Each structure stands twice: as structure tokens, then as C-alpha cells.
Amino acid sequence: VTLQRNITLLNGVAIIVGTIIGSGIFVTPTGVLKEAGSPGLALVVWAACGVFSIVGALCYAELGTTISKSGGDYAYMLEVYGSLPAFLKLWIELLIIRPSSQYIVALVFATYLLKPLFPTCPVPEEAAKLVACLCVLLLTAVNCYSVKAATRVQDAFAAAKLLALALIILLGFVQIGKGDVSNLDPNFSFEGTKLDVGNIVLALYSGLFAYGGWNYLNFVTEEMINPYRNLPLAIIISLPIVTLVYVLTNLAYFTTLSTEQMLSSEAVAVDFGNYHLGVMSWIIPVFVGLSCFGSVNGSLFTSSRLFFVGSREGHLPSILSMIHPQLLTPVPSLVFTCVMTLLYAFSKDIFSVINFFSFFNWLCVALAIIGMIWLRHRKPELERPIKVNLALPVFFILACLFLIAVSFWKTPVECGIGFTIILSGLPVYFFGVWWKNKPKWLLQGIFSTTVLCQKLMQVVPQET
Amino acid sequence: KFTGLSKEELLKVAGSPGWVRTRWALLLLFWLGWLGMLAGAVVIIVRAPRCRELPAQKWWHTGALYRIGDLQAFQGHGAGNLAGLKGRLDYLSSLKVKGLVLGPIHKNQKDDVAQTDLLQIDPNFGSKEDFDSLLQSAKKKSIRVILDLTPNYRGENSWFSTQVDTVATKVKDALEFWLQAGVDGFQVRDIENLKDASSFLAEWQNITKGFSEDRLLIAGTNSSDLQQILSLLESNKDLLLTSSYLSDSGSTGEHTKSLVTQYLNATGNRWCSWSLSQARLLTSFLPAQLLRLYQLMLFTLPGTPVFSYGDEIGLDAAALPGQPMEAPVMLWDESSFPDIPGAVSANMTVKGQSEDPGSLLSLFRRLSDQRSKERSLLHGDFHAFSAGPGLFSYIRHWDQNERFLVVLNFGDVGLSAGLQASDLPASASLPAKADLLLSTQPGREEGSPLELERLKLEPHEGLLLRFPYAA
Ligand SMILES: CCCCCCCCCCCCCCCCCC(=O)OC[C@H](COP(=O)(O)O)OC(=O)CCCCCCCCCCCCCCCCC
Ligand SMILES: CC(C)CCC[C@H](C)[C@H]1CC[C@H]2[C@H]3CC=C4C[C@@H](OC(=O)CCC(=O)O)CC[C@@]4(C)[C@@H]3CC[C@@]12C
Ligand SMILES: CC(C)CCC[C@H](C)[C@H]1CC[C@H]2[C@H]3CC=C4C[C@@H](OC(=O)CCC(=O)O)CC[C@@]4(C)[C@@H]3CC[C@@]12C
Numbered sequence: 044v045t046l047q048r049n050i051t052l053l054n055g056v057a058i059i060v061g062t063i064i065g066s067g068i069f070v071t072p073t074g075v076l077k078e079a080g081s082p083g084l085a086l087v088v089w090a091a092c093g094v095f096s097i098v099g100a101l102c103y104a105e106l107g108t109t110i111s112k113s114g115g116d117y118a119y120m121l122e123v124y125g126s127l128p129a130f131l132k133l134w135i136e137l138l139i140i141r142p143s144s145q146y147i148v149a150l151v152f153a154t155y156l157l158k159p160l161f162p163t164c165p166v167p168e169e170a171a172k173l174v175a176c177l178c179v180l181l182l183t184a185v186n187c188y189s190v191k192a193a194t195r196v197q198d199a200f201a202a203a204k205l206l207a208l209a210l211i212i213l214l215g216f217v218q219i220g221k222g223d224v225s226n227l228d229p230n231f232s233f234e235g236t237k238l239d240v241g242n243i244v245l246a247l248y249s250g251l252f253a254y255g256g257w258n259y260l261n262f263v264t265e266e267m268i269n270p271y272r273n274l275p276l277a278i279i280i281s282l283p284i285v286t287l288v289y290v291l292t293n294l295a296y297f298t299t300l301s302t303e304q305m306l307s308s309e310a311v312a313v314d315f316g317n318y319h320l321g322v323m324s325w326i327i328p329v330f331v332g333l334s335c336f337g338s339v340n341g342s343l344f345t346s347s348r349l350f351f352v353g354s355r356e357g358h359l360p361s362i363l364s365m366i367h368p369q370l371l372t373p374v375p376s377l378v379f380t381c382v383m384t385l386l387y388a389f390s391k392d393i394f395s396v397i398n399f400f401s402f403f404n405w406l407c408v409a410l411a412i413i414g415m416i417w418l419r420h421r422k423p424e425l426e427r428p429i430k431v432n433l434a435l436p437v438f439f440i441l442a443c444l445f446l447i448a449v450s451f452w453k454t455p456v457e458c459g460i461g462f463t464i465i466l467s468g469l470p471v472y473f474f475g476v477w478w479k480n481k482p483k484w485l486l487q488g489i490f491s492t493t494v495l496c497q498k499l500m501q502v503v504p505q506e507t
Numbered sequence: 508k509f510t511g512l513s514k515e516e517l518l519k520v521a522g523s524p525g526w527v528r529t530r531w532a533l534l535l536l537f538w539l540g541w542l543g544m545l546a547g548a549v550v551i552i553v554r555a556p557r558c559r560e561l562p563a564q565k566w567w568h569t570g571a572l573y574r575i576g577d578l579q580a581f582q583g584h585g586a587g588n589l590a591g592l593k594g595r596l597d598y599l600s601s602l603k604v605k606g607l608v609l610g611p612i613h614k615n616q617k618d619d620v621a622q623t624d625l626l627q628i629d630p631n632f633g634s635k636e637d638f639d640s641l642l643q644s645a646k647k648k649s650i651r652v653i654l655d656l657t658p659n660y661r662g663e664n665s666w667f668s669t670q671v672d673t674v675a676t677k678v679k680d681a682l683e684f685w686l687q688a689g690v691d692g693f694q695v696r697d698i699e700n701l702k703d704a705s706s707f708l709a710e711w712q713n714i715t716k717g718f719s720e721d722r723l724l725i726a727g728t729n730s731s732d733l734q735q736i737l738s739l740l741e742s743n744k745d746l747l748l749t750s751s752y753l754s755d756s757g758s759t760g761e762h763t764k765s766l767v768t769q770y771l772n773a774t775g776n777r778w779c780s781w782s783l784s785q786a787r788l789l790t791s792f793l794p795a796q797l798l799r800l801y802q803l804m805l806f807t808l809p810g811t812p813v814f815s816y817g818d819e820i821g822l823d824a825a826a827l828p829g830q831p832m833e834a835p836v837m838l839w840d841e842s843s844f845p846d847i848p849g850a851v852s853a854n855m856t857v858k859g860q861s862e863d864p865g866s867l868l869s870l871f872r873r874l875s876d877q878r879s880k881e882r883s884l885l886h887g888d889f890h891a892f893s894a895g896p897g898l899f900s901y902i903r904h905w906d907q908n909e910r911f912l913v914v915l916n917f918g919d920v921g922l923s924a925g926l927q928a929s930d931l932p933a934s935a936s937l938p939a940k941a942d943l944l945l946s947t948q949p950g951r952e953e954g955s956p957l958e959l960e961r962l963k964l965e966p967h968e969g970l971l972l973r974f975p976y977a978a
């Protein structure tokens with residue numbers, strides 16, 4: 044009884060494209076224009092985040108073909124740095140990182156799908172919270188049903204969001220095809236470029252939010268048909284498509300609206316639909332919701348597979364990583380993902396957790412790529428189907444260390460709170476993992492609740 | 508495996524009847540809970556009240572107009588042509604004005620009626636081509652151009668006292684000519700000297716609207732009587748009218764409050780224009796200690812504020828030696844006023860006041876962007892209410908956006924506010940703690956919330972508190 048590989052090349056392309064293109068292309072440009080000052084600085088920030096994500100994806104393709112086991116970015120750290128940093132990464136990546144990232148996109152889905160009923164108006168908040176929870180519950184039920192159904196969902200919604208962005212891009216092209224330019228003058232487009240790199244790296248963070256999810260096919264390997272070919276071929280095909288669409292969508296945004304027209308706007312896609320369309324301008328918020336639906340589906344998929352792999356190393360309870368026969372899906376891991384995602388619906392503002400934890404999110408990537416170089420030098424007895432040129436990982440490590448050291452130099456009050464939450468897992472590691480020889484007051488109860496959840500969900504252990 | 512059972516044990520234990528019924532019951536219970544959450548979202552969505560529909564504003568609803576009567580005195584000598592006016596459009600874009608009432612640039616010799624022509628440009632301003640370039644240059648800066656078509660602007664009687672018909676006949680062709688040229692509106696001043704006045708403005712308004720619905724017509728009187736204004740506003744309602752209705756008085760605040768509220772009552776809460784005159788500065792009617800209070804008042808009343816050139820720096824005509832009061836020299840820099848060198852100062856000029864945060868130009872710029880951006884100041888609702896003996900307090904509120912509260916002290920003693928609201932609608936009732944956005948006088952720090960119970964005001968102070976939609 045195993046997980047029964049189904050992911051094709053086009054399924055992996057759809058997974059990466061649908062998970063990356065979520066909400067950030069419709070929310071973040073105001074935050075980038077606020078910190079860049081000039082539109083040209085915004086476009087070079089978007090292109091820089093694009094090239095940065097492409098370089099990191101090449102390094103993760105080389106890592107995922109080297110080690111080639113599931114649960115990427117956590118198994119790669121467990122292979123090199125032992126058990127305790129892997130558990131700390133798994134702890135943080137569970138608790139704060141995965142349900143908040145899913146709940147943000149679900150909330151943007153619910154907010155933008157209810158915009159035609161409240162055109163010039165704030166949406167009622169609890170209706171949006173309920174619709175977001177409905178989205179999460181429907182998608183986890185679809186994921187608990189079958190894997191082929193979930194890949195069909197991801198395929199359809201990735202194609203839908205691609206055609207939506209193509210429509211927006213061609214509208215921005217026919218606007219500049221009407222012989223005059225609002226923005227994009229060769230001397231005006233750079234007027235307003237502020238400075239103070241400390242006020243530039245915040246625009247870099249706001250752009251790097253929209254590129255999140257670029258390493259999720261590394262989480263969902265061990266289920267790909269022929270991974271040694273179809274993982275880097277999926278990454279190479281997928282991520283250059285995102286950067287081009289992002290810079291063309293920002294360019295189409297700028298030739299409809301002026302600068303402080305966008306700096307004081309609430310939904311720059313809704314205003315774009317209001318300009319180029321009369322009635323039938325609800326198409327654009329409908330399509331934004333359809334993008335965020337597929338992004339939530341892909342993130343739920345990869346999170347369930349990550350907790351599946353983390354249970355197999357003895358770092359999580361063993362009720363997880365139990366497969367249900369005749370469906371062959373990790374049902375308790377999916378239930379555990381959905382429960383946490385619904386649990387983060389009690390916060391009023393959850394966007395202020397991104398700056399609390401960005402330093403750890405890039406520290407783990409930098410640690411994994413340092414471990415990749417150290418593994419290539421220390422242990423050269425592995426088969427490597429792709430081998431990147433060096434000084435791409437070295438430049439990526441230098442850029443990640445630049446982002447970490449700058450985030451400890453402009454806003455050091457949130458990183459301290461983040462580092463305080465990180466070491467709270469250190470009591471948890473020494474209860475369950477390291478502390479064996481537990482009393483019989485605890486082992487029988489854990490066995491009883493495990494077999495009770497087994498009898499409820501009809502799940503067997505893995506082994507095949 | 509490690510803390511659980513295996514395949515066969517579970518398949519022969521958890522296959523018994525009851526357990527199958529338990530998991531099917533939990534499945535249908537899950538789907539009924541999902542449908543219950545869907546119904547709970549739907550009945551919350553339909554219970555939300557609705558949201559109001561926007562009034563489809565014009566371009567002159569979204570900011571202030573700027574009157575430049577004498578083009579020679581705006582730039583200065585040697586550059587008083589139409590071409591030099593193109594160089595000031597970046598300064599005019601810093602004031603965020605939406606329109607521009609250029610003075611009468613047509614060829615008028617003197618009180619002879621046969622020689623003047625409203626179709627031709629006077630050669631001391633330029634020609635038609637540098638006017639067409641000016642229109643296209645202002646069109647790129649999002650600034651509209653209104654042309655004053657008052658015929659006899661060099662003379663005492665402004666409408667050619669001899670007869671009335673032919674001088675009103677040439678205006679009819681001038682409207683169609685200059686609308687084809689591409690102007691955005693017209694202005695006619697001194698219509699109290701026009702015989703059969705109310706039945707000519709309707710015809711000119713008809714032609715101006717029949718070209719397009721985005722065309723303006725402004726009329727100007729020197730009247731202060733309310734009934735003479737309403738008589739001109741009987742058959743016309745989309746006509747903008749500038750008068751001397753507020754230039755009368757206002758030593759006390761209850762006079763200005765009654766003057767605003769009686770006009771809004773007798774008109775019917777229609778769209779109006781707020782000014783102090785038709786071609787005069789603010790310093791021609793107010794002392795220098797009331798120039799901030801009236802600038803705070805005119806930017807927050809429900810209408811279009813109209814200003815003359817130099818009202819943002821407090822350009823006083825009587826505060827200098829020999830000079831006409833109809834065309835003072837605009838003080839761009841310190842070297843503006845050429846003769847008597849050493850009469851201007853640093854706080855009297857544009858560039859000297861363009862750096863000081865506690866200046867008058869800074870107050871004008873801080874009001875003129877709030878007027879053109881905030882939704883409850885563009886087409887919001889107005890409500891005045893009773894206050895302390897000498898105050899003027901009112902509230903602007905549109906639907907669910909940020910509510911604005913303005914408090915003004917038109918007197919020379921320190922007053923406590925005492926905002927006994929007691930008559931506002933329940934939608935826009937007062938909160939307990941309102942914020943602060945600006946103040947006319949220095950000695951307040953901006954951004955921290957006060958509370959409107961022990962609210963104390965020093966003389967000639969004005970407050971622009973704000974508070975959000977709540978319950
Ligand atoms: C929730 C609905 C989902 C449906 C399926 C149920 C799945 C339940 C998953 C529960 C996951 C929550 C625990 C997260 C993992 C931490 C536990 C672990 O790593 O142990 C491996 C260890 C593996 O055991 P094995 O299965 O025998 O290999 O797990 C345990 O021994 C049992 C741990 C129970 C954890 C309950 C929550 C405890 C939170 C921490 C409380 C404080 C403890 C430290 C005391 C000092 C504090 C100052
Ligand atoms: C663009 C379309 C797909 C609309 C997407 C939203 C749909 C309204 C929802 C409601 C039910 C959902 C799914 C419910 C279960 C499956 C059945 C599945 O077909 C199978 O049974 C394959 C499983 C197998 O062969 O074993 C294909 C469609 C799918 C994904 C459905 C697609 C449509 C979903 C995502
Ligand atoms: C906090 C935890 C302990 C609660 C977990 C409870 C589960 C969320 C519930 C919801 C619906 C339940 C079950 C409803 C139907 C069954 C039977 C089975 O579905 C089938 O029809 C298998 C036969 C087939 O191949 O068609 C697999 C999924 C399962 C166990 C479901 C798994 C999840 C259950 C136990």
C-alpha cells in the first residue's frame with residue numbers, strides 16, 4: 044500500500060503555475076508602487092524577483108534530482124543537518140507558514156467573489172470568512188476523494204487564470220494601440236524613484252510574496268512519473284512563464300491608470316475592468332476568485348504531502364502517514380491540514396505575520412543550498428542527472444544572506460518575536476522524539492486514540 | 508505499524524456493522540454542516556443593507572476653479588502673453604485645481620460696439636495657434652480651460668450700455684466658435700448690467716449643453732440679495748453663479764451659519780459654487796487673521812470653490828505701494844515687484860511659502876488634495892448643528908466612508924465647543940473620540956484622537972476632525 048504515482052509533466056506545470064499565480068498579482072502592486080515611488084522601479088523590482096525565483100528554482104531542481112525523495116526542503120535539511128533543525132523547520136513550516144498562507148488566499152477568493160454584490164462598498168466580513176471556510180472544506184473533500192480529480196481541478200483552474208491574465212494583457216495592448224500613452228514615457232516613467240535600500244527591500248518582499256510557491260513540486264515528488272526528467276523540465280517550462288506574465292500584467296496595469304490613481308486605489312483589477320468595460324465588468328473579480336481557488340487547492344495538496352513525509356521520520360505522530368486503501372489518499376494528513384487552516388480564521392489581520400517570519404523562510408532555503416554544496420563536495424557517490432553551473436548557488440546564498448541581514452537591520456523588532464516563537468518547538472522536540480522510555484500512563488492512551496482514529500477513517504499503515 | 512494496527516486486523520475489526528453506519532452518518536453530518544454554513548453565509552449576505560449608487564459627477568464637481576483675470580500681472584512684464592502661461596501649468600498642478608478661468612483675451616478696443624470682435628484674439632496676448640497649443644498642453648495636465656466672454660472688459664459699463672441685442676447676438680456665435688475651437692466652458696461677468704438677463708442665460712446654457720453635457724457656464728453678479736440670486740436661478744439650475752452673497756458680513760459665526768444654511772434651504776440642496784466675489788481676492792474683504800478660516804470653510808462646503816489668483820499666498824493689494832486693486836502683481840520670487848525694491852519679504856512670495864509647513868500655501872495644498880480625493884467631501888451630505896455661542900460646526904458624510912467634522916471659531920475669545928448634537932441622523936451620529944487631520948493655528952500635533960466633550964478653541968482656530976463609519 045503506497046501512494047501510487049499519477050503526476051504527469053503537464054500536471055506538474057499546472058501545479059506550479061496554479062499555485063504561484065494566486066492573489067499577489069491582484070493585491071501587491073499598490074504595495075510595490077508605495078515603496079518604489081516610480082513605475083520603472085516597480086517594473087525592475089518585479090523582473091528582479093522573477094530572476095531570483097528562476098535561479099532558486101534551478102538550484103531546487105538540482106537538489107530534487109539529487110536526493111529524489113518526497114517532502115522537499117525538509118528532507119534535504121534532514122539528510123544533511125540531522126534531526127533537530129529538520130524538526131524546527133517542520134514545526135515552523137507547519138504552524139505559522141502553511142495555514143496562514145492558505146487562509147490568506149481563501150480570504151482573497153471570498154472577498155473578490157463578493158465584489159459584484161457590493162460594488163463601491165466594504166464587503167461584510169463574516170460572510171467572507173464563511174465563504175473562505177467553505178472553499179477550504181470543499182477542496183479538502185475533493186482531495187480526500189481522489190488524486191486524479193484534484194489534478195483535473197488544478198489543470199482547469201490554471202488554464203482559466205492563464206486565459207484571464209491573457210485577456211487583461213490584450214486589453215492593455217489595445218489601449219496602447221490607440222496612439223497615445225498615459226504612462227510609459229521614456230523620460231517620465233522613472234520620475235519618483237525614492238531611495239534608501241531599506242525602503243527598497245520592502246518592495247522586494249512585496250514582490251517576493253507574489254512568487255511564493257515556486258518549490259512545491261519538490262514537496263510533491265515521489266509521485267511523479269519519471270521524476271529525473273519530468274521535475275526539471277516542469278520547472279524550466281513553468282517559472283519563466285510566470286515572470287513574463289507578471290511584468291506584462293504590471294505593464295498593462297500602468298497604461299490605464301496614473302500613479303497616485305493606483306496608490307490610493309483598493310482593487311486595481313476592478314478599476315481596470317471598470318475602465319475598459321462598461322457592464323460585464325464583473326468578469327475581472329470573478330476571474331480573480333477563480334485564480335485563488337486553484338491556488339488554495341495546490342497549496343493544500345503539497346501541505347498534506349509534507350506532513351505525510353514528516354510523519355514517516357518519527358517527527359510527527361504516526362496516525363499521520365496512514366494511507367486509506369481503495370482510495371490511496373492520505374486522509375488524516377488532509378484533515379489535519381484543513382483543521383489548522385480553519386483555525387487561523389480567528390485573526391483580524393493576518394498579513395502582519397509575513398515580516399515576522401520571512402528571515403526564517405529564506406534562512407531555510409539558504410541552509411538547504413549550503414547543504415547541497417557541502418553534499419556535492421563531501422559525498423560524491425550519487426547519480427546526478429542535472430548539474431548546475433556553480434556561482435548560481437553562491438550568488439543565491441549571497442542574495443538570501445543579504446535579505447536576512449537587511450531584515451535584521453531595518454525592522455529588528457518583529458524578527459525577535461519570530462525567533463521567540465521558533466524556539467518554542469524545542470520543548471516539543473524533547474517530548475515525543477527524543478524522550479523515549481515514556482511511562483505506561485501515556486503510551487496506552489496514544490495507542491488507543493491512534494487505533495480509534497484508524498477505525499474511524501479506515502486507514503492502514505504504509506509499507507507496500 | 509509503530510504505534511498502530513496493520514491491514515488485516517483493521518479490515519476484520521473495522522468492517523463490522525455499526526462502524527460502517529457510524530462513518531456514513533459522519534459523512535452525511537459533514538455535508539449537512541457544509542450546507543448549513545452555506546445557508547448561514549447566504550442569509551448574512553442578503554441581510555446586509557445595500558450600498559448607494561454614485562451620482563455620476565462632472566469634472567467641475569471634483570475640485571476648485573482658479574480665476575486669472577489679468578494675464579499680464581500673473582507672470583509679469585515682458586512675459587504677459589499666452590505662451591508664457593504654459594510655463595505655470597506645473598505650478599497649477601501642485602494646487603490640484605481642476606479648471607482655469609482665463610480672462611477676456613478677445614479684441615476689444617473701447618466702448619465702441621462695431622470695432623470689438625469676440626472671435627479674434629487681441630495681439631497683445633498672442634494668436635490662435637499659441638492658444639491651441641495652450642489647450643493641448645493643459646489637456647495633458649488634466650486641467651480644463653474656461654474662457655471669459657464678457658464683451659466690454661475695458662470700460663465702466665461692462666455690457667455696452669447703448670443697446671442690448673447685437674452685443675448679445677455676437678456672444679451666440681462666439682459660443683459656437685470657441686466650442687469648435689475646443690474650450691471647456693465660458694464665463695460672463697456683471698450680468699446685473701445686462702437687460703433681459705434671465706432669458707439670455709437660458710439660451711446660452713442651451714447652446715453650451717447642446718454641444719456636450721460636459722460643458723460649463725458660469726455667470727457672475729455683484730449682488731448680495733438672496734431673492735435676486737434665486738430669481739436668476741428659477742428656470743436655470745445647472746448654471747454656476749458667483750456672487751457677493753458671503754462678502755456681506757461674518758463678524759459673528761451665527762451670521763455665516765445662517766447665510767450658508769438659508770441658501771442651501773431656499774435652493775433645495777442643489778449643486779452651487781462657493782466664493783466671496785466674482786473677480787476679487789479674499790484679502791479685499793477679510794482681515795489677515797481670517798484667511799485660514801475661510802480657506803478651511805470654502806474647501807469643505809457642498810459645492811465648487813472658486814478662487815482668484817494669489818488667494819493661496821494671501822496676495823494683498825493694499826500692502827504695497829501704488830498698484831491697481833484689479834490686477835496686483837503675483838509675487839513668484841523675491842525679485843517680482845521691480846520698483847520700490849525692498850518692499851516684498853520672504854513670507855510674502857510663492858517660493859518662500861513653498862517650504863514652510865506652517866504657511867498659507869501649505870494649508871491650501873493640504874486642503875486641495877483632501878477635497879479632490881475623499882468621497883464624503885466630493886458628493887457627501889451636509890449637516891450643521893448647534894454649538895457654542897459663536898461657532899460654526901458641521902458634518903460631511905456620504906454613505907459608509909470616512910466622516911468629516913469641521914469646527915470654526917469666528918470670534919476673538921477662547922471658547923469651549925459644547926457640541927450638543929441632538930439632531931443628526933442616526934447613521935452619521937457623533938462618536939466619543941474623533942481624530943485630527945489639521946488645524947489652522949500652530950500648537951497642535953496632528954493624528955492623535957481627541958474627544959469632543961471638553962473641546963477648547965483659541966481665537967480664529969479651525970479644526971478638521973474625522974471619524975469612521977461605526978455604530
Ligand atoms: C486535529 C484533527 C486531525 C485528525 C487526525 C488527528 C491527528 C492529530 C495530530 C496532532 C498533531 C499535533 C502535535 C504536533 C506534533 C508534536 C508532537 C510530536 O512531535 O511527538 C512525536 C510523537 C510520536 O509518537 P509515535 O506516534 O508513538 O511515534 O508523538 C507523541 O508521542 C504524542 C504527542 C501528542 C501531541 C499532542 C499535542 C501536544 C502539544 C505540545 C504540548 C506540550 C508538550 C511539551 C511539554 C513541555 C511544554 C513546556
Ligand atoms: C471548471 C469546472 C470544473 C467547475 C469547478 C467547480 C465545480 C463546481 C466543483 C464542484 C464539484 C468539484 C469536483 C467533484 C469530483 C470530481 C469528479 C471527477 O471525475 C472522477 O470521478 C474521476 C475519479 C476517478 O476516475 O476515479 C472529475 C470532476 C470533479 C473533480 C469535480 C469538478 C468540479 C468541482 C471542483
Ligand atoms: C478529528 C478527527 C478524528 C475527525 C475525522 C473524521 C472525518 C473527518 C470523517 C468525515 C467523514 C468520515 C468518512 C466518510 C466515508 C468513509 C468511507 C470511505 O469512502 C468509501 O466509500 C470507500 C468505498 C469506495 O471505494 O467507494 C473512505 C472515506 C471515509 C472513511 C471518510 C473519512 C473521514 C470521516 C471518518
Ligand SMILES: *[C@@H]1O[C@H](CO)[C@@H](O[C@@H]2O[C@H](CO)[C@@H](O)[C@H](O)[C@H]2NC(C)=O)[C@H](O)[C@H]1NC(C)=O
Binds near residue numbers: 710742
Ligand atoms: C432650450 O430651453 C428652452 C426653454 O428655456 C426649451 O425649449 C426651447 O424653446 C426655444 C424658444 O426659446 C425654442 O426655439 C426651442 O425649439 C425649444 N426647444 C425644443 C422645443 O426642444 C428647451 O428645454 C431647450 N432646448 C432644447 C433643444 O433642449
Ligand SMILES: *[C@@H]1O[C@H](CO)[C@@H](O[C@@H]2O[C@H](CO)[C@@H](O)[C@H](O)[C@H]2NC(C)=O)[C@H](O)[C@H]1NC(C)=O
Binds near residue numbers: 729730731732
Ligand atoms: C453693482 O455695481 C453697481 C456699480 O457700482 C452698483 O450701483 C448701480 O450702478 C448702476 C450704474 O452704474 C445703476 O444703474 C444702479 O441703479 C446702481 N444700483 C443701485 C442699487 O442703485 C450696484 O448697487 C451694485 N450692486 C449691489 C448689489 O451693490
Ligand SMILES: *[C@@H]1O[C@H](CO)[C@@H](O[C@@H]2O[C@H](CO)[C@@H](O)[C@H](O)[C@H]2NC(C)=O)[C@H](O)[C@H]1NC(C)=O
Binds near residue numbers: 772773
Ligand atoms: C427651511 O427649512 C425648513 C425645514 O428645515 C422648512 O421650513 C418649513 O416651511 C414651511 C413653509 O414655508 C412651514 O410650513 C414649515 O412649518 C417649516 N418647517 C420648519 C421646521 O421650519 C423649509 O424647508 C425652509 N423654509 C422655508 C420658509 O422655505
Ligand SMILES: *[C@@H]1O[C@H](CO)[C@@H](O[C@@H]2O[C@H](CO)[C@@H](O)[C@H](O)[C@H]2NC(C)=O)[C@H](O)[C@H]1NC(C)=O
Binds near residue numbers: 852854855
Ligand atoms: C513676515 O515676517 C515678519 C517677521 O517675522 C513679519 O513682521 C511681523 O509683523 C507682525 C504683524 O505684521 C508684527 O506683530 C511683528 O512684530 C513683526 N515682526 C518683525 C520682526 O518685524 C511680517 O508681517 C511677515 N509678513 C506677513 C505678510 O505676514
Ligand SMILES: N[C@@]1(C(=O)O)CCc2ccc(OCc3cccc4ccccc34)cc2C1
Binds near residue numbers: 062
Ligand atoms: N503566490 C501566492 C499568491 O497568492 O500570490 C500563492 C502562494 C503562496 C505560497 C506560499 C507563500 O509564502 C508566504 C510566506 C512566506 C514566509 C513567511 C510566511 C509567514 C506567514 C505566512 C506566509 C509566509 C506565499 C504565497 C503567495
